[PDB]
Write a protein that binds this ligand. Sequence first.
Ligand SMILES: Cc1cn(-c2cc(C(=O)Nc3ccc(C)c(NC(=O)c4ccno4)c3)cc(C(F)(F)F)c2)cn1
Length: 268
Amino acid sequence: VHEFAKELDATNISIDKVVGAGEFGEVCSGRLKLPSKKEISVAIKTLKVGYTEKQRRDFLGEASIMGQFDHPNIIRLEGVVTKSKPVMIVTEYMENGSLDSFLRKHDAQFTVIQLVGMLRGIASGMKYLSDMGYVHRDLAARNILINSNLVCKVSDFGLPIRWTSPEAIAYRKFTSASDVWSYGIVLWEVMSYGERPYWEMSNQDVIKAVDEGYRLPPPMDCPAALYQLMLDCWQKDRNNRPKFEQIVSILDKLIRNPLKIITNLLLD
Ligand SMILES: Cc1cn(-c2cc(C(=O)Nc3ccc(C)c(NC(=O)c4ccno4)c3)cc(C(F)(F)F)c2)cn1
């Protein structure tokens, strides 16, 4: 763990309050005093009292993964506490919480360009994870955190049929291209302001429908460019899906605001 995670001194951590009502795990917000004496807001996940050795190993392995990724759109590991208990993982604080729950509070209240900025941040984080050989496997709006300035950052709270590509469902073929499929689902979630993908369809029907070529329909008022981007991410042939670098490039062009062309499952 210490290869990729700094050991924090518990005397530098103050705990404020419980956050997220369990959605992130056993997580609090608080402050961390850095070696330079600067104090920053942080999220703190604690390992349960009475943990088993496997639970500790799994907890510290998580920190080890996170510590590998230093990027503006991937959740930043500040460090771990292992030499005292409770054992902790400390990250930057993301004031606006998970993106799906945030958007549900704000239905139709953001501009298209604001939503595209969110989407671009997520794609940039994924471009770095993929460049680093990391396949996320659970890329979903609930695993994206959003801060006070609406910057979105790839996270993972653990457990996902609705977000999984057909090949990863069929025979566990997980690649960065199956993450691109997942990104198309997140793109739909964002444009739908946190609607659940495939709503409450039976999992077996989500699997069969997608395999038969059916896809989620355009969100209300969804620009054609963005719906086409979803369809491109949802290509049956993983080789035909765009790479994350190309997704970032697409969004960067839309950010220049060229987009006013507007578009149960659709046979696509
Ligand atoms: C089992 C496992 C999970 N992960 C993993 C966890 C996480 C992650 O986000 N973990 C995590 C751990 C501790 C905390 C405190 C947080 N942050 C928050 O819960 C949070 C809430 C609000 N602000 O921050 C987040 C991220 C990544 C990713 F994709 F970015 F590479 C991977 C790796 N292995």
